[PDB]
Enzyme design. Sequence first.
Site, PDB file in Angstrom:
ATOM      1  N   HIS A   1       0.818  -1.205   0.000  1.00 56.85           N
ATOM      2  CA  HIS A   1       0.000   0.000   0.000  1.00 56.85           C
ATOM      3  C   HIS A   1       0.874   1.287   0.000  1.00 56.85           C
ATOM      4  CE1 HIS A   1      -3.911   2.114   0.661  1.00 56.85           C
ATOM      5  NE2 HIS A   1      -3.103   3.018   1.193  1.00 56.85           N
ATOM      6  N   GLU A   2       1.801   1.405   0.948  1.00 53.53           N
ATOM      7  CA  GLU A   2       2.608   2.623   1.066  1.00 53.53           C
ATOM      8  C   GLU A   2       3.477   2.917  -0.156  1.00 53.53           C
ATOM      9  OE1 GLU A   2       1.547   4.556   3.078  1.00 53.53           O
ATOM     10  OE2 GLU A   2       0.366   3.151   4.260  1.00 53.53           O
TER      11      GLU A   2
ATOM     12  N   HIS B   1       1.500   4.192  -3.263  1.00 56.67           N
ATOM     13  CA  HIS B   1       1.306   5.671  -3.237  1.00 56.67           C
ATOM     14  C   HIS B   1       2.391   6.504  -3.877  1.00 56.67           C
ATOM     15  CE1 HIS B   1      -2.406   6.365  -1.214  1.00 56.67           C
ATOM     16  NE2 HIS B   1      -2.060   5.738  -0.105  1.00 56.67           N
TER      17      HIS B   1
ATOM     18  N   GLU C   1      -6.932   6.535  -2.886  1.00 51.87           N
ATOM     19  CA  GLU C   1      -6.992   5.251  -2.147  1.00 51.87           C
ATOM     20  C   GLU C   1      -7.423   4.025  -2.973  1.00 51.87           C
ATOM     21  OE1 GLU C   1      -5.429   5.153   0.372  1.00 51.87           O
ATOM     22  OE2 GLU C   1      -5.238   7.320   0.592  1.00 51.87           O
TER      23      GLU C   1
ATOM     24  N   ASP D   1     -11.165  14.275   9.191  1.00 58.14           N
ATOM     25  CA  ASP D   1     -10.886  13.234  10.188  1.00 58.14           C
ATOM     26  C   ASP D   1     -12.155  12.541  10.719  1.00 58.14           C
ATOM     27  OD1 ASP D   1      -8.135  13.505  10.010  1.00 58.14           O
ATOM     28  OD2 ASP D   1      -8.043  15.042  11.582  1.00 58.14           O
TER      29      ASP D   1
ATOM     30  N   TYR E   1     -11.405   3.540   0.241  1.00 49.86           N
ATOM     31  CA  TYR E   1     -10.460   2.437  -0.074  1.00 49.86           C
ATOM     32  C   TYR E   1     -11.205   1.294  -0.761  1.00 49.86           C
ATOM     33  CZ  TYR E   1      -7.216   4.429   3.536  1.00 49.86           C
ATOM     34  OH  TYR E   1      -6.386   5.260   4.315  1.00 49.86           O
TER      35      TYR E   1
HETATM   36  O1  LIG Z   1     -10.877  13.416   2.419  1.00 45.98           O
HETATM   37  C1  LIG Z   1     -10.969  12.398   3.077  1.00 45.98           C
HETATM   38  C2  LIG Z   1     -12.167  11.493   2.823  1.00 45.98           C
HETATM   39  C3  LIG Z   1     -12.770  10.724   3.811  1.00 45.98           C
HETATM   40  C4  LIG Z   1     -13.848   9.914   3.450  1.00 45.98           C
HETATM   41  N1  LIG Z   1     -14.325   9.885   2.202  1.00 45.98           N
HETATM   42  C5  LIG Z   1     -13.780  10.614   1.237  1.00 45.98           C
HETATM   43  C6  LIG Z   1     -12.708  11.428   1.536  1.00 45.98           C
HETATM   44  C7  LIG Z   1      -9.823  12.205   4.037  1.00 45.98           C
HETATM   45  C8  LIG Z   1     -10.075  12.243   5.390  1.00 45.98           C
HETATM   46  C9  LIG Z   1      -9.019  12.094   6.268  1.00 45.98           C
HETATM   47  C10 LIG Z   1      -7.713  11.914   5.819  1.00 45.98           C
HETATM   48  O2  LIG Z   1      -6.743  11.778   6.787  1.00 45.98           O
HETATM   49  C11 LIG Z   1      -5.469  11.213   6.529  1.00 45.98           C
HETATM   50  C12 LIG Z   1      -5.033  10.284   7.636  1.00 45.98           C
HETATM   51  N2  LIG Z   1      -4.295   9.203   6.971  1.00 45.98           N
HETATM   52  C13 LIG Z   1      -2.847   9.145   7.013  1.00 45.98           C
HETATM   53  C14 LIG Z   1      -2.563   7.692   6.606  1.00 45.98           C
HETATM   54  C15 LIG Z   1      -3.868   7.032   6.197  1.00 45.98           C
HETATM   55  C16 LIG Z   1      -4.953   8.103   6.283  1.00 45.98           C
HETATM   56  C17 LIG Z   1      -7.442  11.900   4.457  1.00 45.98           C
HETATM   57  C18 LIG Z   1      -8.504  12.060   3.572  1.00 45.98           C
HETATM   58 ZN   LIG Z   2      -3.602   5.017   1.414  1.00 42.91          ZN
END
Ligand SMILES: O=C(c1ccncc1)c1ccc(OCCN2CCCC2)cc1
Ligand SMILES: [Zn+2]
Length: 605
Positions: free
Chosen positions: A291-292, A295, A314, A371, A379
């Site tokens: 996964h990482e 990206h 994702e 958040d 995903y």
């Molecule tokens: O923009 C979003 C999102 C959430 C749900 N549906 C569509 C979009 C989003 C929310 C939170 C977010 O936080 C990042 C935290 N991480 C770091 C590693 C994995 C996720 C990133 C993107």
């Molecule tokens: Zn990811």
Amino acid sequence: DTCSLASPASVCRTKHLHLRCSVDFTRRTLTGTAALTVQSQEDNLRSLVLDTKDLTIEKVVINGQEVKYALGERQSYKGSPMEISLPIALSKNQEIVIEISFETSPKSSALQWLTPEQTSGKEHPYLFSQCQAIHCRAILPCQDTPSVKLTYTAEVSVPKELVALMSAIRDGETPDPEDPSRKIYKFIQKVPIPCYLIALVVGALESRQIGPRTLVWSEKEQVEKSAYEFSETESMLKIAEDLGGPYVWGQYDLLVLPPSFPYGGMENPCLTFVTPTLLAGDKSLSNVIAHEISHSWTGNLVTNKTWDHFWLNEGHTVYLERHICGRLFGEKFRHFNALGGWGELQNSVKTFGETHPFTKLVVDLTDIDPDVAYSSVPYEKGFALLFYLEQLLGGPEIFLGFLKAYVEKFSYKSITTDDWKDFLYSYFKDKVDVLNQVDWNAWLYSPGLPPIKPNYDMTLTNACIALSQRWITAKEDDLNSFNATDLKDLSSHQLNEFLAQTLQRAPLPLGHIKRMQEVYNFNAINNSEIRFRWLRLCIQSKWEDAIPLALKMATEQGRMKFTRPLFKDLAAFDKSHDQAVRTYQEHKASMHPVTAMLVGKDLKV
Ligand SMILES: O=C(c1ccncc1)c1ccc(OCCN2CCCC2)cc1
Ligand SMILES: [Zn+2]
Ligand SMILES: [Yb+3]
């Protein structure tokens, strides 16, 4: 970009950040200057607006002089907008450097500051950042949107006995000229990135090389275990290069963080961050590294333009992750993980409710803290779309030609779902008729489970379903027939799917769960994915013995995937409810600020 208060890319664009700062563990602040090289996108530009969150601005300097700026009122999680008055109007494409002297707050949502006792060594403190999605503004003023890509260099002063690293190539260390108890570490990121990809860690770190272009970093006590767990890293990268094209980032390093890191991984360029909960002893949670790595193309090269389009990051990453796992371990294994993924999607859509706006693939994050919206939906629903399209368009080898071409097309850009779909229609122009049988409006914009389920090879999943159904249909007088040899021919993965299957029909009678522990001794399994599902099952089926075990895991590590539902489950069980809120409150101060907040909401405290 509705999650940002800054001037959009149509007004002005940051090309570069030079960050000079000092990490002060005594005050739990970072202090310094952020020099943004800004390019006007319009005629007669006289003002410019930046995102900030809980920042203290000393001053703002352009062309050697202090200029006027003002801070707007806080808008909750978006922070406060910073309007800077340019000393001279700019024409289209003109560039200036703006130098902002700032200090962060100890309450910065981007940061976790750890006392020495919160680390492995017990001697030194530690600091890490997590900027995704909109936390970069809580470290430094910026246009905090993925719609804008910049390069950066940085210079970071830290106590000399500690190490600093970032999401960049290391570019030398020297003693701090202004304080001999300190070192300055230097960094360059030559590849333009969205600012959510900016990262920093300061701690007592050591490194061990594990491939031609990969060092593992962590505290002394985790190094040896980490180098083994992740030894397949180079060979995953090689596969990802064949799938998506050249790895353009130089180095692929790995940082293994203290247990409060909130995520399985964060795909910080040059230096991926992972949870220590990946350290199973046996490489079984390596899907997360794939996964990482993936990206490095999907999200770091082609980036979502706004967070409404996160599923682009994702979905394509999970798509590539699974291909990687299919190359290493075989096509039936790809189908196993994919079907599992679908089951994760059922759980998320059950949890939120099938008409919940957050179960939309594309969402509208207007007035939503990202958040709060974050889950498996982007995903697994995104991966589900791509898998559906793969079977529809003629198979994996054909859809991978599109994924590679899609990466080349949109490299170094930020895109929307329509950019993605227009390109999909161009690449498969000879299959436009097949494309039109897809219900676009449903897949992209409707809540709930997608309207068509792909086909899945069931070979590896059957034995899991079989054993799960035995447990669920069993009465008292059937419990005797369960035996340790039932697990005989299951990998850890199939053992995890066994529990996942069973967890979906929880609660089970208490006697069943006791008997499961009697014969399978799940209490002994240290694999964090398995242990999680097991403790959940035990808590929802009301086993009081599981209470201390689940409180311990919930608090000894802080991966949100585990800590949040364990706390919820604990709170919903009348017997553990009170210890759940109690434990939260006694741990709350020492938790990651984002985990603390979300757990607090989950518990209604
Ligand atoms: O923009 C979003 C999102 C959430 C749900 N549906 C569509 C979009 C989003 C929310 C939170 C977010 O936080 C990042 C935290 N991480 C770091 C590693 C994995 C996720 C990133 C993107
Ligand atoms: Zn990811
Ligand atoms: Yb003009």
